[PDB]
Structure formats: C-alpha cells, structure tokens
C-alpha cells in the first residue's frame, strides 16, 4: 500500500506515546514531508477513534497559519499522517534565543496564532494544547509565519455547547475550568493564548512553580502579575489584552474574533 | 523565579 512504495524515511523530528515524526521524501515527486508514524498493532477501540479524529480534524483545517495534512495512509501495523515539512523549528526555541519579542513582533505573532485559533473555532475544533512548542516557524528567515501544529489532543465541539471533555493539555497552559474539572470549550484556547502572549513580551511564563499543586492553585486563582524590570516598558494595552485572555470566568474571557479587533492587534 | 521550560502534554491527571 501507498506509503511503503512511494515514500523514503530519513531522520527523526520528534517522538510520541506510540509514534515518531520523521522527515520523508515522496521519491518520484522529489518533495519532502514530515510523517507522524503511529504503531497500530493491538490499538484499543478508543485509540483507533482518536487516530481517526486527529486525521479528520487535520484534513478539515485549511489555513495559512495551520500545518497542512498532505495525506492519511493506513498500512498493516502502521498509520502515516503526512504533513507539510516546516523547517523553522518551534516558536519556543526562537523566544529562548531572542529572550523576548518587541511589541510589534509579539503583536504580529499572536495575530497569526489567533487567526489559526479563530479558523479552528469556526470549524468546531478546540486544540486544548496551545504552547510555543506546538507553534512552528515556516522558515529560518526572521519574520517567517507561525503554523499551529499537533492536533493529537484536539476535540470536535457542536457550536458553543460545552462539556467535561476530560483532563488534557500542558500544566503551564491549562485553563482554570480544566483544573477545576468543570465543563469547558473554545475559551480554553484563548487562556493558553494569554500565557503565550505573556511569554512573547518578557520571555518567561505568568504561572510557574516547582510544586505542580501550587502551580494549579495560582492558575485557578488567576494569580499572575507584571514584575519590574521587564514589564516597566510594556504598554498598558498589551497588559489589557493579556488581562482579557487571562480572565478566570470563560464566559467573560475575550474570544479569538474579539482579540483580533483589540487596538494592540488591529491598529497595526 | 519563573522560567521558560519545555513541558510534557497529559491526557489524564497526575
Ligand atoms: C506531532 C504530530 C504533528 C506533526 C506535524 C509535523 C509538521 N511538520 C514539521 O516539519 O514538523 C517539524 C518538527 O516537528 C515536531 O513538532 C511537531 C518537532 O517537535 C519540532 O522540532 C518541529 O521542528
């Protein structure tokens, strides 16, 4: 079947629970891709549902700031999710290297992220796991576009209907409603956007603790601040957008659509 | 003091 006869495998790009991500070449086309290779030998019925869900969600999303799924190939004992190759690496690595982004660069960055999240939300997809590791740069040329990646934890929602969809995400980026084990939906992504925007502007996260129990307490109480000296030169309107994203009550939290109309984004 | 660190994803509670 198609992958084994048409594609050649090269170096590893990442790891998963029962998957690797490897660079591959479609040999006759001379085009390179990133292949998520899932070992499907004795997968549970639910694990088969989640693989199909990831494939369906990735096929659904067509956006300049979302990684394109090229193909979904089922072979004996192996499934291949074939994505466009993205060579700029994690947004995470670029923030660490540059320490922080200027407000102009941070605004441009979060604008692209919010456009990607807006599209997801319009198509009834909640990512649930937004973070700098899951945002890739299109090239190594500075000012390259950001691409939302890894919909392995993504869920399908029916309009604005919210529910307990289970405990999933990354500690530092988890919304209060997920940590309380309360019903949630699209707003969990805007909370994560708030954490990412905070990181962009000063190069460290708003919530952090060696003790995970204290981390979760600080998140649930929205106990973040803007310490000196890094926040001393940051505009009030940057702090305002962060505040509206890092709103504990998900009803009153800014939406993707609203965030894109905020003066700090739109007047620029 | 808060640090930018790579963190692992969960699909159930710790
Ligand atoms: C994780 C399943 C989706 C794979 C999407 C591949 C997109 N193309 C793609 O070329 O991914 C590149 C690498 O892929 C991983 O991140 C997704 C590495 O952690 C990163 O170092 C990143 O550079």
XYZ file of C-alpha atoms in Angstrom, chain A residues 201-202 204 227-234, chain B residues 1:
12
model
C 6.654 40.013 25.703
C 9.112 39.201 28.622
C 9.101 33.834 30.945
C 7.004 42.425 37.806
C 9.821 45.030 37.340
C 12.060 45.402 35.491
C 10.854 43.504 32.332
C 7.252 44.961 32.462
C 8.473 48.581 33.133
C 8.485 49.461 29.344
C 5.432 47.329 28.218
C 11.789 32.772 39.627
